[PDB]
């Protein structure tokens, strides 16, 4: 079965990685499907450019091999932040993008392992309070992936081009809905 560990990303070693599952259809939320090396390079560097060092990209590992990428970024620096999106920005508050590899054999439940196993680094390694999620509202397969983890749908908001759903997990839903992060919801 899958167990993770991860690690801070290391741009001069993961660029080229990270630009291929950019480039995958699969990962076309994103929005980086004809990106160049350099506009990669750009997005891992603006990604850990916060004053926190909570923040920034990570990799994540199993047998040895590279498997997904999360970003843990800073609310107050991005589209949440806007004004009138109906975000109620508090202490602790920590965003969360996923990026899975390009790699297509997977053994059964590869993105639930993921999940929890981002979440926990998120609240027990990264201090959060809450976990703030905004992927576009059409992006069905991550939402049933936040409801698996214990995300809460708060409402959707407009950007100039999409329609946002912001959702919530709270730490302590966090825990009641997985057991600790030991399993998925119910």
Known sequence: TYHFQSRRIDVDRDLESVHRWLGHPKSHYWDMLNSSLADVEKLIRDAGADPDPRFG??????????????????PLTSDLARPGTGYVYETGDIGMHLLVSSSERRLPGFTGA????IMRTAFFEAGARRVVVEPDVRNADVQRLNAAVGFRVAGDFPVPGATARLSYCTREDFARATDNGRTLAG
């Not at 990209?57 to 800073?74: P, S």
């Not at 993921?114 to 196993?117: I, R, S």
């Open 57 to 74: 990209m990570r990799i994540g590992y199993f047998e040895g091999e590279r498997q997904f990428l999360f970003e843990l970024y800073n």
């Open 114 to 117: 993921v999940m929890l196993h």
